[PDB]
């Protein structure tokens, strides 16, 4: 219920643009990227033994 | 006393129409968020027992 005003109508839907469409194709490649050195990282880590 | 300052002239009314539309504008969704979640979240707080 912001469509009603053209100044947050607009605002509203520049949100959406950047969110789910250019922003949740970040978070993939973000992701997957931290989980990659995450699981790569504590290998170097001494037997705990 | 600007008023033939180039710059400082510039800057003077700019802040007039574009701060109190876009702070006003960035109040909405920040009042329709913030209400929102911290209500969720003590409401997931518990109870004094």
Do not use: E, H
């Not at 605002?11 to 969110?19: A, E, G, V």
């Not at 970040?26 to 990659?36: A, K, Q, S, T």
């Amino acid at each position: 219920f912001t469509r009603g005003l053209k100044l947050t109508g607009t605002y509203s839907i520049m949100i959406q643009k950047i969110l789910f469409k250019d922003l949740f194709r970040f978070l993939l490649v973000y992701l997957l990227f931290m989980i990659g050195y995450a699981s790569a990282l504590v290998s170097l880590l001494n037997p705990c033994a």
